[PDB]
């Protein structure tokens, strides 16, 4: 019965990690940020409404130019929008309409999408022909594609419902690295600003820190009570925020290896579909099932604002790299740019 | 707006048009979510109608059906079952020759999957076309193996008719919220050749009753 002895050692190691986290827990982030001036009530207003999706929008991603954004809808369309002019730049017909993630390449030359087809499809936005075409179909995940994020034009990291994340060489189409260790469906990804490591939240109510080059889970963060649907790094890359089904957002520090705040209101019971940070990181914008985005003071756990204006579940949201705008997509087939 | 801005707006309007015709074309398709236990006979159901998820397309009496098979999605279903929220109907396949089998009992697994899908929060009004497959093999096994193995409280004849009716009732009583949805149970084995007709009848019935409910007549 060597299983018991190994399980005993694993339990002892878990206790050691818990004690190490508790020893560093000298002062919660709330205690330190009592003296900081609380930004009372930000009033973000819908600047644009992106209409043209005919089903539930499941994912959006901003371009690095902070003007172009891709959106994924179950109508089988990957639409690229000019958010300034509201114009649609591209409407990409998806081979599988069951898309639930979309990424935009940091170069802007590619978008990725995927979902229940278990394929991460890479689309060449900039062809000699005037059409967007599938440049690559990344097969190898055995569950649905829940998130994808480009490292560059040739590296993309994908999370899946097969409980694993994968690093793909797009030119070869092969899984360069597989990130195993999650026991539940991995729902969200967030690349660190340096893209040398990323966090993934899964349905085992845990967020894991993965080194892209090493392929190892450097840290595991367990503070949520239900499935983690959303994850987002802090702008400096030393912390990340999660969004779970327990109506709670949490901020986990990488270096402290511990959770720093819980962003939960007793009047909120719906799960979080998407989290994102403003450019400075002081605001944590979270999309919810109660149809609206809540803006949180990331440093004080204060509900600084509400982005109400969607008639269905806010499935996705991202802040532009310049931080000028937040676009929230929702199940009511509408994308709204706020500011 | 500059000349290039005007031409970009024109391109966006052409994209809007194409999205409009694509949505109009997609609205004329009856969406079906196909469920079951994989070994339940949904494969021969697909064959009669004709990795990731499989979309099977067929037309019957001028209705075009899009039937989505999600059996290959071995991941947690709560995270993607809402994708099929607006589905016209659910086609649930259950092998009748699974009462005496085990993976727990196969028919108990089918029963709990059916209960979860039927009473799912996303399918409160979506009717279920319940296919009870392997009726001939169910005959050949009910002749020898009693149904009391799966249902200890059966207390009934071990003949095909009574046993099959009992299984159908056991599946249909898992249907809570019986006001908002209906179960269209069909008995097939592998050569019924009326399964597409049954699905057409069930879907047209669902459409007609939805239209009646709109008008306050159901």
């Amino acid at each position, epitope marked *: 019965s060597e299983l018991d002895q190994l399980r005993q050692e694993a339990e002892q190691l878990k206790n050691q990690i818990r004690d190490a986290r508790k020893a560093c827990a000298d002062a919660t982030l709330s205690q330190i940020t009592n003296n900081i001036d609380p930004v009372g009530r930000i009033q973000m207003r819908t600047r644009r409404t992106l209409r043209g999706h005919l089903a539930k929008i499941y994912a959006m991603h901003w371009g690095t130019d902070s*003007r*172009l954004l891709v959106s994924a809808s179950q109508d089988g369309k990957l639409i690229i929008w*000019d958010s300034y*002019t509201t*114009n649609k*730049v*591209h409407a990409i017909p998806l081979r599988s309409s069951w898309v639930m993630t979309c990424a935009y390449a940091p170069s*802007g030359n590619y978008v990725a999408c995927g979902g229940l087809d278990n394929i991460c499809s890479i689309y060449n936005l*900039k062809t*000699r*022909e*005037g*059409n967007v075409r599938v440049s690559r179909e990344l097969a190898g995940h055995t569950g649905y594609l829940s998130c994808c994020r480009f490292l560059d034009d040739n590296q993309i990291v994908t999370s899946s419902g097969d409980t694993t994340c994968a690093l793909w060489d797009i030119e070869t189409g092969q899984q360069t690295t597989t990130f195993t260790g999650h026991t539940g469906d991995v729902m969200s990804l967030s690349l660190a600003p340096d893209t040398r490591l990323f966090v993934s939240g899964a349905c085992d109510a845990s967020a894991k820190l993965w080194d892209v080059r090493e392929g190892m889970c450097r840290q595991t963060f367990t503070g949520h009570e239900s499935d983690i649907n959303a994850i987002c790094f802090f702008p400096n890359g030393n912390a990340f925020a999660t969004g779970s089904d327990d109506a709670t957002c949490r901020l986990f520090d990488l270096r402290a290896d511990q959770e720093l705040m819980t962003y939960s209101h007793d009047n909120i019971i719906c799960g979080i579909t998407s989290v994102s940070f403003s450019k400075s990181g002081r605001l944590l914008l979270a999309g919810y099932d109660d149809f609206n985005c809540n803006v949180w003071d990331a440093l004080k756990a204060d509900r600084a604002g509400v982005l109400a204006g969607h008639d269905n579940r806010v499935s996705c949201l991202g802040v532009t790299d310049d931080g000028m705008a937040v676009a929230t997509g929702s199940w009511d087939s509408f994308l709204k740019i706020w500011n | *707006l*500059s*000349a*290039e*801005d*005007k*031409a*970009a707006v*024109e*391109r*966006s309007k*052409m994209i809007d048009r194409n999205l409009r015709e694509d949505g109009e074309k997609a609205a004329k398709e009856v969406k079906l979510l196909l469920l079951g236990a994989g070994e339940s006979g949904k494969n021969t159901i697909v064959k009669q109608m004709k990795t990731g998820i499989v979309e099977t397309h067929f037309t019957f009496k001028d209705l075009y059906f899009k039937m989505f098979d999600v059996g290959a999605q071995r991941s947690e279903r709560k995270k993607w079952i809402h994708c099929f929220e607006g589905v016209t109907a659910i086609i649930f396949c259950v092998a009748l020759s699974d009462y005496d089998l085990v993976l727990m009992n196969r028919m108990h697994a089918s029963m709990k999957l059916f209960d979860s899908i039927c009473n799912n929060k996303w399918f409160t009004e979506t009717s279920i076309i319940l296919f009870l497959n392997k009726k001939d093999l169910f005959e050949e096994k009910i002749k020898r193996s009693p149904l009391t193995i799966c249902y200890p409280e059966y207390t009934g004849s071990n003949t095909y008719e009574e046993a099959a009716a009992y299984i159908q009732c056991q599946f249909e009583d898992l249907n809570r919220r019986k006001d908002t949805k209906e179960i269209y149970t069909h008995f097939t084995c592998s050569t019924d050749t009326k399964n597409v007709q049954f699905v057409f009848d069930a879907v047209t019935d669902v459409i007609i009753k939805n239209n009646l409910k709109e008008c306050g007549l159901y």
Partner: single-chain antibody, 232 residues
Framework: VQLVESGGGLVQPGGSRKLSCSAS????????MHWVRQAPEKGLEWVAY????????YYADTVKGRFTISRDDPKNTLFLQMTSLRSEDTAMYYC??????????????WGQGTTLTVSSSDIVMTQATSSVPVTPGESVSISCRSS???????????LYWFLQRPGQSPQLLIY???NLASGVPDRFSGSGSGTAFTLTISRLEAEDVGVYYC?????????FGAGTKLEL
């Protein structure tokens, strides 16, 4: 990607011709197509524009009413119906594909062209300098003057640079001023502001020899500069 022009030839004045553009290798229906003509010894002159989906059409004031532009999207063909051909229509007619979305590269590909030898408020691009003498490996700057500020209130400056290499169709170098076109070496650079622009070549070669044309894309009389030739 190729555009092949059909038609042209000797025409008695007052006649009628149809120019045909057999487009292949690209999504023709999504590109707004242009006709840009060039007289046998003079510079480029934009003739007609038909947008993607045919919903928007423009003609040069020298051909409006007199010319008709049309496209056959199923057949991937662009047409220029010409009636009452004056001697001023004696030019090589180029079909130019141009696509318009955010960040697109209009005028990126040009057809080979067919010569048409007819028998016997517009913004003014000015290239006063012409036929510069250059030595390979040495930098050169080509100036461009505009009669109006090409910089739109949206932030874009709609100046285009083309290279008419000897015996070859024009080739887009820089599309929206300081925007290098795909396939162009990163030694051409675009610069300027408002009405004055420069196209600088970092270290030219023998392949850089040709005529360099401006173009405004701010309104739709599309006007070119009297191209500045380069010669060794």
């Amino acid at each position: 990607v190729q555009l092949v022009e059909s038609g042209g030839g000797l025409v008695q004045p007052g006649g009628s011709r149809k120019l045909s553009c057999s487009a292949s290798g690209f999504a023709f229906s999504s590109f707004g197509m242009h006709w840009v003509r060039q007289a046998p010894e003079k510079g480029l002159e934009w003739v007609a524009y038909i947008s993607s989906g045919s919903g928007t059409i423009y003609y040069a004031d020298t051909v409006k009413g007199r010319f008709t532009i049309s496209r056959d999207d199923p057949k991937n063909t662009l047409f220029l119906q010409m009636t009452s051909l004056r001697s001023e229509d004696t030019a090589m007619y180029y079909c130019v594909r141009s696509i318009y979305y955010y960040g697109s590269s209009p005028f990126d590909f040009w057809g080979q062209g067919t010569t048409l030898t007819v028998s016997s408020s517009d913004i003014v691009m000015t290239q006063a300098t012409s036929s510069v003498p250059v030595t390979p490996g040495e930098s050169v700057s080509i100036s461009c003057r505009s009669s109006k500020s090409l910089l739109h209130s949206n932030g874009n400056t709609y100046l285009y640079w083309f290279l008419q290499r000897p015996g070859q169709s024009p080739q887009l170098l820089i599309y929206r001023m300081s925007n290098l076109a795909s396939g162009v070496p990163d030694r051409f650079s675009g610069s300027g502001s408002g009405t004055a622009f420069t196209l600088t070549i970092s270290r030219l070669e023998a392949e850089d020899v040709g005529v360099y044309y401006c173009m405004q894309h701010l309104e739709y009389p599309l006007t070119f500069g009297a191209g500045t030739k380069l010669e060794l």
